[PDB]
């Protein structure tokens, strides 16, 4: 039956040939367990590729392109099989086809190819996929097609090692600046995941995202209705504030901190964790940045989470409270103890996580030194807590850095 399909796919009779290619396509398209290996093994790929040249029969270009889309959606080995067959140049040709359904199906097939990894990505780029792919972005295009275009845009941004060439990023960013203004959720989500990926690849890429003009349009989406956009926006903006004080100030000057009360009280544990993670990277900043977090009424809300959050959120809140005791002035830390930090800040000394107890201690070590006169006054708030007796254990910890600190604090 497969043997018949392949013979027939090369037929000089148009009906016989179209029915065969459509039958090859329906094997690949009609369950979620398609026989890709058998199709490849049967000699179909060259005929499907050759059908891509048949500008005279666009029904056949479409059906061949759909078959190849689904073969190239499998294992890297199956994707390699398509690419090995000289399919990419012919897909790129079909991006200039007058039949929309043929353009879209070519865009889809190149998405599966770009999605295989960075060599296939950099090959499709090197042949000029990005101009023609972005030029489909227009209001006139149907939504289902534009979603397939934004999904390919995510696939171009997806790999860090190596990331796409600087010049490709420079072509894609202007398209994301347009797409970030859309209302369709799947498109907004795809656009913000592209930005997550582009800002997850170190300070040069981050500067390109800033230079693009897009940050004032990204930060408002921290307050979008759909959690799925919020999760992506918070990631992308969190990636940017792992850069310089100056790169951070760009996010702060977009009024980012206005959106945090909703994130620090969000019902999803993960949105809380990433919000405190983000704020941990603002309090590791200069004293104006530390002050901005104070002025936005966020320190009390970071403490609630220090106390009553999942282990994950607490860890992040430890850091945000700790990072502050380092970067800040003695008035800024004064504000802290006035906000009942020491209780929920000492209740974490007894966790199996070395790094958390380590950063909790430093914070108490650093807070007492910078609270000069009122050093005793702090101790009587550590008694009531009953974290004095959890400091003892530390002194028995395997890890040197922790026990020293315990003794080093005992003295004073």
């Amino acid at each position: 039956s497969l043997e018949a399909i392949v013979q027939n796919a090369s037929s000089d009779n148009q009906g016989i040939q179209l029915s065969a290619v459509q039958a090859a396509r329906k094997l690949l398209s009609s369950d979620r367990n398609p026989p890709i290996d058998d199709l490849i093994k049967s000699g179909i790929l060259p005929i499907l590729v050759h059908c891509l040249e048949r500008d005279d029969n666009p029904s056949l270009q479409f059906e061949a392109a759909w078959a190849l889309t689904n073969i190239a959606s499998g294992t890297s080995e199956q994707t390699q099989a398509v690419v090995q067959s000289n399919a990419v140049p012919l897909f790129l040709r079909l991006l200039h086809s007058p039949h929309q359904n043929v353009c879209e199906q070519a865009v889809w097939a190149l998405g599966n190819i770009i999605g295989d990894g960075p060599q296939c990505r950099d090959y499709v780029i090197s042949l000029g996929v990005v101009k023609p792919l972005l030029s489909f972005i227009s209001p006139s295009i149907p939504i289902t097609f534009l979603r397939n275009v934004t999904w390919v845009m995510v696939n171009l941004c997806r790999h860090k090692d190596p990331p796409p060439p600087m010049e490709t990023i420079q072509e894609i960013l202007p398209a994301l600046c347009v797409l970030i203004h859309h209302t369709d959720v799947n498109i907004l989500v795809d656009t913000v995941w592209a930005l997550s990926y582009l800002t997850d690849a170190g300070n040069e890429q981050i500067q390109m995202v800033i230079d693009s003009g897009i940050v004032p349009h990204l930060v408002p989406l921290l307050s979008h209705q759909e959690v799925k956009v919020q999760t992506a926006a918070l990631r992308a903006v969190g990636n940017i504030v792992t850069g310089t004080d100056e790169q951070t100030q760009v996010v702060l000057n977009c009024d980012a901190l206005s959106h945090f009360p909703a994130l620090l009280t969000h019902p999803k544990e993960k949105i809380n964790k990433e919000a405190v993670w983000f704020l941990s990277n603002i309090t590791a900043g200069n004293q104006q940045q530390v002050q901005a977090v104070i002025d936005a009424n966020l320190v009390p809300m970071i403490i609630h989470l220090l106390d009553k959050g999942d282990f994950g959120t607490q860890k992040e809140a430890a850091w945000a409270i700790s990072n502050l005791t380092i970067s800040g002035r003695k008035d800024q830390v004064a504000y802290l103890i006035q906000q009942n930090v020491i209780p929920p800040f000492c209740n974490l000394l007894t966790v199996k996580d070395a790094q958390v107890v380590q950063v909790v201690l430093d914070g108490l070590s650093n807070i007492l030194k910078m609270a000069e006169d009122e050093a005793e006054t702090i101790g009587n708030l550590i008694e009531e807590c009953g974290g004095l007796e959890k400091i003892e254990q530390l002194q028995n910890h395997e890890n040197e850095d922790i026990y020293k600190l315990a003794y080093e604090i005992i003295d004073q």
Binding site: S29, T79, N112
Partner: peptide, 6 residues
């Protein structure tokens, strides 16, 4: 990252 059309 890859999507079959079905």
């Amino acid at each position: 990252r890859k999507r079959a059309k079905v």
